[PDB]
Amino acid sequence: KWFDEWNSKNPTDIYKPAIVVGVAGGAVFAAALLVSMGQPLATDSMQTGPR
Amino acid sequence: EETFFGNFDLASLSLWLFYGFFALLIYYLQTENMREGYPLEDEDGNTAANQGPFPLPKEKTFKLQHGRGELTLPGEDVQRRDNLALRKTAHGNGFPMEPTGDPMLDGVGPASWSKRRDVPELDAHGHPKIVPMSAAEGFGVSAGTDPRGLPVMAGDGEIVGLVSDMWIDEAEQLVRYLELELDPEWGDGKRLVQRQMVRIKSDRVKVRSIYGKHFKNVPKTKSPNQVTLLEEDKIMAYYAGGTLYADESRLEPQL
Amino acid sequence: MSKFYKIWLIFDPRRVFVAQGVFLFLLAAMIHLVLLSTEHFNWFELAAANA
Amino acid sequence: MSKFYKIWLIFDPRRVFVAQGVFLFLLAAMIHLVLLSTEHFNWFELAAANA
Amino acid sequence: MSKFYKIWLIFDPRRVFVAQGVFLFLLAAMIHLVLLSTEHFNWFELAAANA
Amino acid sequence: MSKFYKIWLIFDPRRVFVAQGVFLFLLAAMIHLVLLSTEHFNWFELAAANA
Amino acid sequence: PEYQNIFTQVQVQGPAELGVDNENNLTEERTTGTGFSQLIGWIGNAQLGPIYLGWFGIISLVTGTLWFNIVGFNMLSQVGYSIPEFIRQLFWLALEPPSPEYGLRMPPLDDGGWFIIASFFLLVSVISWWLRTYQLAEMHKMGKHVAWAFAAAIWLFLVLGLFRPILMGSWSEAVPYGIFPHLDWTTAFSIRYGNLYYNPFHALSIVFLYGSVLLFAMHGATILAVTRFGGDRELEQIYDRGTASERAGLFWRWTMGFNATMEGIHRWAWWFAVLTPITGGIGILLTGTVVDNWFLWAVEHNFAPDYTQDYGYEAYTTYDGFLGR
Amino acid sequence: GHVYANAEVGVTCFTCHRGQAVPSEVWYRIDPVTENTSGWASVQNRATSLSQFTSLPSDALYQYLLNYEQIAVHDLESRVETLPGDPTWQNTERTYSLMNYF
Amino acid sequence: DLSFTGLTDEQAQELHSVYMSGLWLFSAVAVVAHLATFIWRPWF
Amino acid sequence: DLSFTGLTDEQAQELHSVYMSGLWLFSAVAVVAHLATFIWRPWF
Amino acid sequence: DLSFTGLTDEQAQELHSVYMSGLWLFSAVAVVAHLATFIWRPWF
Amino acid sequence: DLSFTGLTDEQAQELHSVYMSGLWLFSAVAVVAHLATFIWRPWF
Amino acid sequence: ALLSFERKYRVRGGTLIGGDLFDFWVGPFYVGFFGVTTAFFALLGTILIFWGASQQGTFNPWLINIAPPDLSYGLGMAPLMEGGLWQIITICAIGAFVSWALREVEICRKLGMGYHVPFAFSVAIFAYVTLVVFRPLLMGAWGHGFPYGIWSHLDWVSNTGYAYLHFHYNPAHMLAVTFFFTTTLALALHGALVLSAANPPKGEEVKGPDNEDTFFRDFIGYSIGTLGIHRVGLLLALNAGFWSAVCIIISGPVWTKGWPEWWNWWLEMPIWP
Ligand code: BCL
Numbered sequence A: 001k002w003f004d005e006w007n008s009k010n011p012t013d014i015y016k017p018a019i020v021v022g023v024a025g026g027a028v029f030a031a032a033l034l035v036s037m038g039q040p041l042a043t044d045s046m047q048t049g050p051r
Numbered sequence B: 001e002e003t004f005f006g007n008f009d010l011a012s013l014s015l016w017l018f019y020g021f022f023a024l025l026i027y028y029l030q031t032e033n034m035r036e037g038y039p040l041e042d043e044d045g046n047t048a049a050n051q052g053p054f055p056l057p058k059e060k061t062f063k064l065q066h067g068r069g070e071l072t073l074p075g076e077d078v079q080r081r082d083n084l085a086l087r088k089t090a091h092g093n094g095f096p097m098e099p100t101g102d103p104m105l106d107g108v109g110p111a112s113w114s115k116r117r118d119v120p121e122l123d124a125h126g127h128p129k130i131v132p133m134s135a136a137e138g139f140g141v142s143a144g145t146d147p148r149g150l151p152v153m154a155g156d157g158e159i160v161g162l163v164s165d166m167w168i169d170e171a172e173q174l175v176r177y178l179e180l181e182l183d184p185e186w187g188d189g190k191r192l193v194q195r196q197m198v199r200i201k202s203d204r205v206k207v208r209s210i211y212g213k214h215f216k217n218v219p220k221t222k223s224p225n226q227v228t229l230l231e232e233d234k235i236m237a238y239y240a241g242g243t244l245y246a247d248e249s250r251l252e253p254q255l
Numbered sequence C, D, E, F: 001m002s003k004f005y006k007i008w009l010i011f012d013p014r015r016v017f018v019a020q021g022v023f024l025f026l027l028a029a030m031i032h033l034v035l036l037s038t039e040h041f042n043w044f045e046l047a048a049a050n051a
Numbered sequence G: 001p002e003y004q005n006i007f008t009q010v011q012v013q014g015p016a017e018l019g020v021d022n023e024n025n026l027t028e029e030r031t032t033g034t035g036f037s038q039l040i041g042w043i044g045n046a047q048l049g050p051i052y053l054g055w056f057g058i059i060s061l062v063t064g065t066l067w068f069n070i071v072g073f074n075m076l077s078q079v080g081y082s083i084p085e086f087i088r089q090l091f092w093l094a095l096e097p098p099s100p101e102y103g104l105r106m107p108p109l110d111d112g113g114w115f116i117i118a119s120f121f122l123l124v125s126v127i128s129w130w131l132r133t134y135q136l137a138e139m140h141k142m143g144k145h146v147a148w149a150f151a152a153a154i155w156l157f158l159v160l161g162l163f164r165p166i167l168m169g170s171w172s173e174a175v176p177y178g179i180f181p182h183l184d185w186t187t188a189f190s191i192r193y194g195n196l197y198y199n200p201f202h203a204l205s206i207v208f209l210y211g212s213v214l215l216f217a218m219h220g221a222t223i224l225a226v227t228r229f230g231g232d233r234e235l236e237q238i239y240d241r242g243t244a245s246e247r248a249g250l251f252w253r254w255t256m257g258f259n260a261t262m263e264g265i266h267r268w269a270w271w272f273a274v275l276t277p278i279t280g281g282i283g284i285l286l287t288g289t290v291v292d293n294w295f296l297w298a299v300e301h302n303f304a305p306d307y308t309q310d311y312g313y314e315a316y317t318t319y320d321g322f323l324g325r
Numbered sequence H: 001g002h003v004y005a006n007a008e009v010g011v012t013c014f015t016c017h018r019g020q021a022v023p024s025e026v027w028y029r030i031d032p033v034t035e036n037t038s039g040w041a042s043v044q045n046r047a048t049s050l051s052q053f054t055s056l057p058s059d060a061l062y063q064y065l066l067n068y069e070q071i072a073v074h075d076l077e078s079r080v081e082t083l084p085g086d087p088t089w090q091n092t093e094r095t096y097s098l099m100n101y102f
Numbered sequence I, J, K, L: 001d002l003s004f005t006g007l008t009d010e011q012a013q014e015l016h017s018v019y020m021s022g023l024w025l026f027s028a029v030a031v032v033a034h035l036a037t038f039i040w041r042p043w044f
Numbered sequence M: 001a002l003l004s005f006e007r008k009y010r011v012r013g014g015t016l017i018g019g020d021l022f023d024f025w026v027g028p029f030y031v032g033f034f035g036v037t038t039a040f041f042a043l044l045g046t047i048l049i050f051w052g053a054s055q056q057g058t059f060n061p062w063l064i065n066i067a068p069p070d071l072s073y074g075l076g077m078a079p080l081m082e083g084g085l086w087q088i089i090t091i092c093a094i095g096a097f098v099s100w101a102l103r104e105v106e107i108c109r110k111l112g113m114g115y116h117v118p119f120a121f122s123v124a125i126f127a128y129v130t131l132v133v134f135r136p137l138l139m140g141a142w143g144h145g146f147p148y149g150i151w152s153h154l155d156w157v158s159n160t161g162y163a164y165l166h167f168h169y170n171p172a173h174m175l176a177v178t179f180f181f182t183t184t185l186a187l188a189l190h191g192a193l194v195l196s197a198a199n200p201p202k203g204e205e206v207k208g209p210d211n212e213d214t215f216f217r218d219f220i221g222y223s224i225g226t227l228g229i230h231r232v233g234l235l236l237a238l239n240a241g242f243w244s245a246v247c248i249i250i251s252g253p254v255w256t257k258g259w260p261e262w263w264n265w266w267l268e269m270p271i272w273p
């Protein structure tokens, strides 16, 4: 029975999760899409001149 | 084609002539950009012993409209501030200054204003350029969301009042300022906010730079129908100083 | 170990539980996708066909 | 030579110390990398060849 | 040598500790990677070859 | 000349000292590198040859 | 986040602005009629029109229309007047300069006459447009900077099409009127006279083009970042310095050790852009008339790099190894 | 010297023919590719079966690989005296088309 | 006696007593799922 | 006495003692690691 | 007396004493390292 | 008396004495190094 | 030495990391954590370049060339005299560029401005990283990057352009070239208009924004405004950079034939007779 703690001391619950979510869901997952878009078609090259 | 001596042909001569021309042009361009803020000073206000590699330019004159006279540059710094509430943190040069009292109220740091003229900017007709929408003939909202009547939200999440009017630029057909009416709990009178520091939503207007308790100390205009250049500089500097001075965590390192 | 409960005297439980739930999901989804992208572990091999 | 202590009436130690700290580490990294690009003094390759 | 403690009258420890941690971790990672880039000291390849 | 001390009434010692330090280090590095571009004065290669 | 000032939040509309006037009576030649576009109002001004009608503008319009129509009808006749095949091969067609065997003489209509007529009309149109841009600034009692910067591009235009073919003695040195066919001319010109990379004036032109793009990026970002202090009103900041100019200067002073003024940055911009076609035209005019192989010129003047390794694939791999057999 | 350049590789019927009476990749003369044109304008400005998807001349393979015309276009000194009859950028375009075909 | 959150020692203990059970149930379910998946296809 | 950080003499001494202790422990661990690595695969 | 930094004579003397104490220890360590390296692989 | 930097005559003399001492020490070290190098590998 | 109006802006605070351990100036330059890192990385890279030049045999600025390794090394580390120096210098350059951007962010924060300039610099950094990191990674070898030489990095561009035969037929190259030309034209027009307003003929008063708006509506029938021109210039420059990166990244890993062949989809649509 503690409702007198929440209503007395209120902030924002959803702010830190939004960070976690825009970090992995955002950056990590989209990086995968972009890499796995061009790399599925592998390429090999033959050298015919000086480096 | 033949060569004057060695490998010297017309192309080489053109290249060397361009080199000389470019040196002269660089000198001219650098000199033209030293008409404001010179000569240099040290941190104690005295003239510095070093002044640079490039000498100062000669004087040029502007002729202003609406009978304001002439402006000759380079000259004396007429936009200089007189009494700054600042303190030194070292006996030499190259270290920061520390505010003496309240940086937001004293106009130092990112809250700094420049001493502009105490007159409004005019249009081609000779009238004040920025006018409240209640006194502009034939103007109206044509697209987007109308913010009049919506409540205003502070940076810490407090409702301070309502938007009562908009001040627009008649010559360029653009909104410049938003006028607010403060609640009695958060001050008295009306204040202006620049359009570039607000976000208009479907149910509210958000101002994130300053907090709820900072809204009563925003500088006010002398007249309800016009604003001078000094007043604008003082108002916009106040709103920009809060991005660093509103909260102690905004100034300390973020890591 | 007996005094591990004092963590809630440092961090706010309300903003911790939501972030933890937002992390455990977006971890499980990543692991499931990693399993799917392989051949031996794709279970949509016994699936994707009906006799 | 006995009055060399008077340099600290010209320069503040706060700037001087960071300048010296950058310079010394730069020097060390440069010298080690220069040694690593020769044949006679490359110790990683000497260890491999000696075995 | 016995008065080296006066370095903390010049530099703030709160700011020194973070920079020192960053420097030490980056140095450790760089050295481990340099070892991994060779042949004689790459312990992932040695395990494969030896067994 | 005994009146050479008056150069410090025209130039600030703080800026001259910095300029002199930069100039001297760059000059030393330039000379040391010019020596190593020859065959007769490259001490690394001479060490390698003498073994 | 904070508002970034890329798209306007709300738009307002009032009576249309018909423009300023003086004793020169500009209102006499202006059209009546204006419009408003709310789609372009999100990024800039919404008002469309009115426009000024003079003799130079009308002459330029008529001659340019004639040039366009001559090129188009020649391209249409070259394909048999078949509209679907005209559309199918639009990017590959062109009106071709004369053959080298005619020198500077007038060729037949079949082998370059139409090309000469179209070139004459285009030249008239461009010169008339430049005259219009000069006259408007003269009648507005302003400076002549716009005309001088348009003349710098006209210099490279004229060198490409008129001056160099006369110096070389053949109308066959000009550029064909077509899309893929003029990009073929660019590549063939580079191949014919060695390597245009080793032309020092081509390199200077590239320097100035890169610099102008860099400068516009810097200036646009800087002005947008001080707009919260009313920085986009540049003329009043020139006449009466404010805190926007001071912050804008101090940013670059603390970044790279030197800065500009609000008026002096536009001089930098004006020179970097105009110096591109001038150096380009100087470089183009020297090719073929003075220098015939730019790589050999670079070898002679000792700035051509030298390579030690070998050429050919058999020095690096094997045909079976590449195929994976 | 060509068919045995690196190893023993000959030619038989099953090198041009591959089971067909008419071998694939044979070419004809198509030089006038546009109408109402007379000279250098008569051979190039069109995407044809001989031009390699470009608008470069379709005249090649008939002046070079059937007739005997010069392929080289470069000047062999940094400064030379240009004469009429010397190669121009149009000869360079024809050589560019041939090299695209190669 | 630190409290950056406005709780008192006994309230934090009661909260932790529920958090621990909530964690242990998840752990047990995950253990059973991993046992089943290993039975399907071993990876060691 | 000269001080730019606001600390006193005694506080600086007390802090330096603990900092030196940490430095010595770190160095001892590194020495043991380097000895083991050299025994396994010697350079020099 | 000339003082751009605000320090006195005694403060400068103390600072220089500690600074040179650091410099000499650094130099001694470097000398030992150089001697060991020369014994391992001479360059003269 | 002319002075752009704000110094005095006596201050300039005192500074120049120490500057010259440092210059002479640097030069002596350089001379010894050059002599050792010349004995090692002559260039004249 | 400071400007006449500069002292009131030089306050303490506004750092991402470091506090006042590095919060000072050296001459006009601001120093911070990222100033220290920039100095270290840039100095190390420059000194390594000159060491490689001395070992090559020439100090001529036109002729110095430091090259990446052979294709047979793949994505591994090469000997320092056969390509490893290029890799170390590449790492140093990436570190230096990122440090420069973060220093700009700290300066922006201290001055109370927006962060448009570091964001705009990030696009140039992205183009460089695409040239030296992403494309070689997709192609499978570090030897696909361009060399570090004033005149030798033009030979790389030439040979890479001619490996797809006729590179002008690349559509993304067309878009990038168009954006470059349009950006330059817009910059010329903007500078000219502002200078012409501020500098009238001798004996004449100065002009205002109404005059500029009138000149361009008379000239061409439309005026973009004094706020729209800066947005348009920034957008054009950023588009130029982005499409340059796209055009280079599609040439190696996505398309292998010559570029004229790509238009065969248009040349052979069923809608034609
Ligand atoms: C045979 C040659 C081919 C050809 C081959 C190629 C190839 C191949 C490439 C292009 C590329 C480009 N081509 Mg093309 N191209 C050709 C002909 C043309 C023609 C023409 C005929 O007029 C034009 C106008 C162009 C122009 C262009 C641009 C669209 C583009 C340039 C990249 C850029 O600006 O990124 C600008 C971005 C950068 C890389 C700059 C990075 C800056 C960094 C971040 C900062 C460095 C700081 C520095 C060290 C500080 C020093 C100063 C201090 C004081 C120390 N091409 C011919 C037909 N072209 C290039 C491209 O798009 O690559 C991206 C490319 O690779």
Ligand code: BCL
Pocket: G126, G153, G154, G156, G157, G186, G187, G189, G190, G196, G197, G201, G202, G205, G206, G209, G276, G277, G279, G280, G281, G283, G284, M157, M181
């Ligand atoms: C294989 C191709 C060759 C090459 C061949 C050439 C040739 C050939 C030329 C260029 C030229 C240029 N090259 Mg190069 N060039 C190459 C590769 C490159 C690369 C690269 C690889 O990165 C780059 C960045 C460049 C860049 C450049 C530019 C810097 C320069 C063009 C000047 C200018 O301002 O153009 C802007 C263009 C103009 C201003 C033209 C004039 C336009 C006029 C004003 C238009 C009038 C209006 C019109 C008629 C009416 C329209 C109607 C409307 C609907 C109303 N080159 C390679 C090596 N280069 C030019 C130059 O100057 O060389 C010295 C040139 O002639």
Ligand SMILES: CC[C@H]1c2cc3[nH]c4c(c3C)C(=O)[C@H](C(=O)OC)c4c3nc(cc4[nH]c(cc(n2)[C@@H]1C)c(C(C)=O)c4C)[C@@H](C)[C@@H]3CCC(=O)OC/C=C(\C)CCC[C@H](C)CCC[C@H](C)CCCC(C)C
Pocket: G033, G034, G035, G036, G037, G040, G048, G049, G050, G051, G061, G064, M220, M221, M222
């Ligand atoms: C990139 C710079 C070039 C340029 C572009 C340009 N021309 C323009 C515009 C622009 C951006 C206009 O906005 C304006 C216009 O109305 O376009 C639709 C116009 C115009 N200026 C013109 C002349 C013109 N300018 C020229 C020059 C140039 N202006 C430059 C070369 C030339 C040349 C190439 O020599 C000519 C022939 C016509 C192309 C057009 C005529 C406009 C006019 O007579 O008065 C203003 C418009 C009205 C009468 C009212 C609205 C009717 C519009 C003509 C149609 C669109 C209305 C619609 C409701 C809005 C849709 C959005 C539009 C943006 C398309």
Ligand SMILES: CC[C@H]1c2cc3[nH]c4c(c3C)C(=O)[C@H](C(=O)OC)c4c3nc(cc4[nH]c(cc(n2)[C@@H]1C)c(C(C)=O)c4C)[C@@H](C)[C@@H]3CCC(=O)OC/C=C(\C)CCC[C@H](C)CCC[C@H](C)CCCC(C)C
Pocket: G060, G061, G063, G064, G065, G068, G125, G126, G129, G130, G133, G146, G149, G150, G152, G153, G273, G274, G276, G277, M181, M182, M184, M185, M188, M189, M220
């Ligand atoms: C400093 C050099 C840079 C530069 C500068 C520059 N260009 C300029 C100027 C300046 C300073 C002008 O003042 C002038 C201008 O009017 O700008 C708005 C111009 C100009 N630069 C132009 C083109 C141009 N500039 C280029 C380059 C550059 N310009 C450089 C990068 C390039 C290339 C290849 O990069 C091109 C293609 C024009 C838009 C304009 C010159 C207009 C002109 O001379 O028009 C003559 C008129 C005709 C030929 C009539 C054409 C008839 C048409 C077939 C129809 C009528 C027009 C209609 C509006 C178009 C169709 C509209 C449809 C909706 C129907």
Ligand SMILES: CC[C@H]1c2cc3[nH]c4c(c3C)C(=O)[C@H](C(=O)OC)c4c3nc(cc4[nH]c(cc(n2)[C@@H]1C)c(C(C)=O)c4C)[C@@H](C)[C@@H]3CCC(=O)OC/C=C(\C)CCC[C@H](C)CCC[C@H](C)CCCC(C)C
Pocket: G210, G213, G214, G217, G218, G221, G255, G256, M041, M042, M043, M045, M046, M089, M092, M093, M096, M097, M100, M117, M118, M120, M121, M123, M124, M147, M148, M149, M150, M151, M153, M237, M238, M240, M241, M242
């Ligand atoms: C579309 C984006 C355009 C752009 C934007 C842009 N550039 C920028 C900015 C912006 C917005 C800045 O704010 C920033 C700046 O401060 O400018 C003054 C900058 C900048 N862009 C610059 C240059 C530059 N920009 C270029 C291009 C562009 N910049 C684009 C066209 C180019 C080219 C090739 O076109 C160059 C050369 C610098 C002047 C500056 C930032 C440079 C800087 O300070 O870097 C920090 C590091 C050092 C001091 C030196 C590091 C040295 C290395 C460690 C060693 C050398 C390595 C290198 C790879 C060798 C190359 C050899 C060559 C022969 C190839």
Ligand SMILES: COC1=C(OC)C(=O)C(C/C=C(\C)CC/C=C(\C)CC/C=C(\C)CC/C=C(\C)CC/C=C(\C)CC/C=C(\C)CC/C=C(/C)CC/C=C(\C)CC/C=C(\C)CCC=C(C)C)=C(C)C1=O
Pocket: D018, D019, D022, F018, F022, G218, G219, G220, G222, G223, G245, G248, G249, G250, G252, G255, G256, G257, G258, G259, G260, G261, G262, G265, G268, M026, M029, M030, M031, M035, M036, M038, M039
């Ligand atoms: C309206 O608005 C606007 C303005 O306003 C009004 C503007 O102005 C501008 C700006 C535009 C212009 C000025 C136009 C001209 C611009 C160009 C042509 C752009 C191209 C620019 C260049 C070619 C030059 C750029 C120069 C660069 C990048 C190099 C400068 C950098 C350095 C020298 C190093 C920086 C220093 C650092 C990091 C600090 C040092 C580090 C330390 C750890 C300090 C400790 C000390 C030491 C180790 C030793 C001492 C160090 C010293 C002396 C530093 C110097 C280094 C040396 C080696 C001596 C714009 C756009 C604008 O729109």
Ligand SMILES: COC(C)(C)C(=O)C/C=C(\C)CC/C=C(\C)CC/C=C(\C)CCCC/C(C)=C/CCC(C)CC/C=C(\C)CCC=C(C)C
Pocket: C003, C004, C005, C006, C007, C009, C010, E028, E029, E032, E033, I002
């Ligand atoms: C091989 O080479 C490469 C580069 C690939 C590498 O792999 C390189 C790898 C490295 C260089 C790795 C380096 C790794 C380290 C330096 C690791 C260091 C790790 C630690 C220091 C870990 C510390 C962990 C501590 C933990 C988990 C503590 C937990 C504490 C608690 C759960 C208690 C919570 C506290 C409470 C409740 C306080 C009570 C509150 C009151 C109010 C009283």
Ligand SMILES: COC(C)(C)C(=O)C/C=C(\C)CC/C=C(\C)CC/C=C(\C)CCCC/C(C)=C/CCC(C)CC/C=C(\C)CCC=C(C)C
Pocket: D028, D029, D032, D033, E031, E034, J014, J015, J018, J019, J020, J021, J022, J023, J026
């Ligand atoms: C081979 O060639 C190449 C280039 C590849 C190289 O690898 C070259 C490499 C180098 C040149 C490397 C150089 C490396 C160095 C110079 C390394 C230096 C390292 C140190 C000086 C490390 C110091 C570490 C110190 C530590 C860990 C100290 C303390 C730690 C603590 C946890 C102490 C905690 C303190 C407290 C609590 C004080 C509180 C007190 C109060 C009173 C509040």
Ligand SMILES: COC(C)(C)C(=O)C/C=C(\C)CC/C=C(\C)CC/C=C(\C)CCCC/C(C)=C/CCC(C)CC/C=C(\C)CCC=C(C)C
Pocket: D031, D034, E003, E004, E005, E006, E007, E009, E010, F028, F029, F032, F033, J002, K014, K015, K018, K019, K020, K021, K022, K023, K026
């Ligand atoms: C061979 O060719 C190439 C180019 C490859 C080269 O390698 C060329 C190389 C050179 C040209 C190299 C040149 C090198 C130098 C000039 C090196 C100079 C080095 C020094 C001057 C080093 C000085 C070091 C000094 C030190 C470490 C001093 C003190 C350290 C302390 C920790 C002291 C701390 C002091 C305190 C706490 C004072 C506090 C007191 C109070 C009272 C507050």
Ligand SMILES: COC(C)(C)C(=O)C/C=C(\C)CC/C=C(\C)CC/C=C(\C)CCCC/C(C)=C/CC[C@H](C)CC/C=C(\C)CCC=C(C)C
Pocket: D003, D004, D005, D006, D007, D009, D010, F027, F031, F034, K002, L014, L015, L018, L019, L020, L021, L022, L023, L024, L026
């Ligand atoms: C071979 O051809 C090539 C091009 C390769 C070359 O190599 C050509 C090379 C040259 C042309 C080289 C030319 C080189 C020179 C001209 C070099 C000159 C060098 C000097 C003049 C050096 C002087 C150094 C002096 C110093 C270090 C003196 C003193 C320093 C200090 C004393 C520091 C302490 C100062 C104090 C305490 C002052 C404070 C006093 C108070 C009273 C407050």
Ligand SMILES: COC(C)(C)C(=O)C/C=C(\C)CC/C=C(\C)CC/C=C(\C)CCCC/C(C)=C\CCC(C)CC/C=C(\C)CCC=C(C)C
Pocket: G068, G069, G070, G071, G072, G073, G076, G116, G119, G120, G122, G123, G157, G158, G159, G160, G161, G162, G175, G176, G177, G178, G179, G182
């Ligand atoms: C038939 O269908 C209709 C009616 C719809 C049409 O009209 C359709 C029309 C088309 C589809 C038209 C398409 C047109 C093009 C694709 C045109 C492309 C044009 C170019 C790329 C032109 C480039 C021109 C010029 C260049 C690159 C440089 C310089 C040129 C000049 C300086 C020209 C000037 C010439 C002079 C001065 C010579 C005059 C000679 C005298 C003797 C006075």
Ligand SMILES: [Fe+3]
Pocket: G219, G223, G234, M190, M194
């Ligand atoms: Fe501007």
